[PDB]
Design a protein around this ligand. Structure first.
Ligand SMILES: *CCC(=O)Nc1cc(Nc2nccc(-c3cnc4c(C)cccn34)n2)c(OC)cc1N(C)CCN(C)C
Length: 268
């Protein structure tokens, strides 16, 4: 099928978060009285254009939307500003305030976004750092610098480490690790263990431990994402169904103590 997506080129005259350098700013298209909060981000240019290609070809409420590119000294990525940052730093900074409702709803939304399978698109870098927070009730998947059967070792499936094979089911493995990051409130997977030994550990049968707040119901879903047989791992459509049921009774599945500005989503 022909990819009829539109690549919008933005004037520099129409415009620091992290350090390349990603900046926070406002996009003001000429004429229309609208201010849009945005994030402004030969080998370097070739890869950011590949990333712009992917983001321009996706359109889903749980996938970061591309607004356009600006052709200056270096090509700039202009995307929607997610004011609450990445989900990894968010759960670390707000441990003592994340309830079971938010955790289970985030798992639903991330599984919904991983739409990417409908687009026949493999992310190859799903992680808590690559999930941005528009609002505490709305997260989106980002970072398509590795998007493409067809590197962060501690998030990859065993077949990806041994044979460099990436499928939608290898993304399911990374989804399981990402859920583990949220349920541990931002712990580092295999903390201390060097990356070179991850291949030997997964082969012996060892996995990430059961997070303290996780009932066996939730931890069983993560274990199923970490099976050797990729086709035995659950599908993203099934993970949507499972986490949705649990989100209707969150305290039964997570045990936690004490439980003219226009946004880009409205500039269509
Ligand atoms: C895990 C880090 C992080 O996401 N920090 C962050 C993100 C904000 N929002 C936002 N919106 C759109 C695009 C980005 C973005 C895209 N690529 C990057 C990189 C490589 C680094 C940082 C942001 N990127 N981000 C945001 O908006 C307020 C703030 C932050 N922080 C600065 C919080 C992290 N801080 C505690 C270090």
């Amino acid at each position: 099928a022909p990819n009829q997506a539109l690549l919008r080129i933005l004037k520099e005259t129409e415009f620091v978060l992290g350090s390349g350098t990603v900046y926070k700013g406002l996009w003001i298209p000429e004429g229309e009285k609208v201010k849009i909060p945005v994030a402004i981000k030969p080998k370097a240019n070739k890869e950011i254009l590949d990333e712009a290609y992917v983001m321009a070809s996706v359109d889903n409420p749980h996938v970061c939307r591309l607004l356009g590119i600006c052709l200056t000294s270096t090509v700039q990525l202009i995307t929607q500003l997610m004011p609450f940052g990445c989900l990894l730093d968010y759960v670390r900074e707000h441990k003592d305030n994340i309830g079971s409702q938010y955790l289970l709803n985030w798992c639903v939304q991330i599984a919904k976004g991983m739409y990417l399978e409908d687009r026949r698109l493999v992310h190859r870098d799903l992680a808590a750092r690559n999930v941005l927070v528009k609002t505490p009730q709305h997260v989106k998947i980002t970072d398509f610098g590795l998007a493409k059967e067809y590197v962060p070792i501690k998030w990859m499936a065993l077949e990806s480490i041994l044979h460099r094979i990436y499928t939608h089911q290898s993304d399911v493995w990374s989804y399981g690790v990402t859920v583990w990051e949220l349920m541990t409130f931002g712990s580092k997977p295999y903390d201390g263990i060097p990356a070179s030994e991850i291949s030997s550990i997964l082969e012996k049968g060892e996995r990430l431990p059961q997070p303290p707040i996780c009932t066996i119901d939730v931890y069983m879903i993560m274990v199923k994402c970490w099976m050797i047989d990729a086709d035995s791992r659950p599908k993203f459509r099934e993970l949507i169904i499972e986490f949705s049921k649990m989100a209707r009774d969150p305290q039964r599945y997570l045990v936690i103590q004490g439980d003219d500005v226009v946004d880009a989503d409205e500039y269509l």
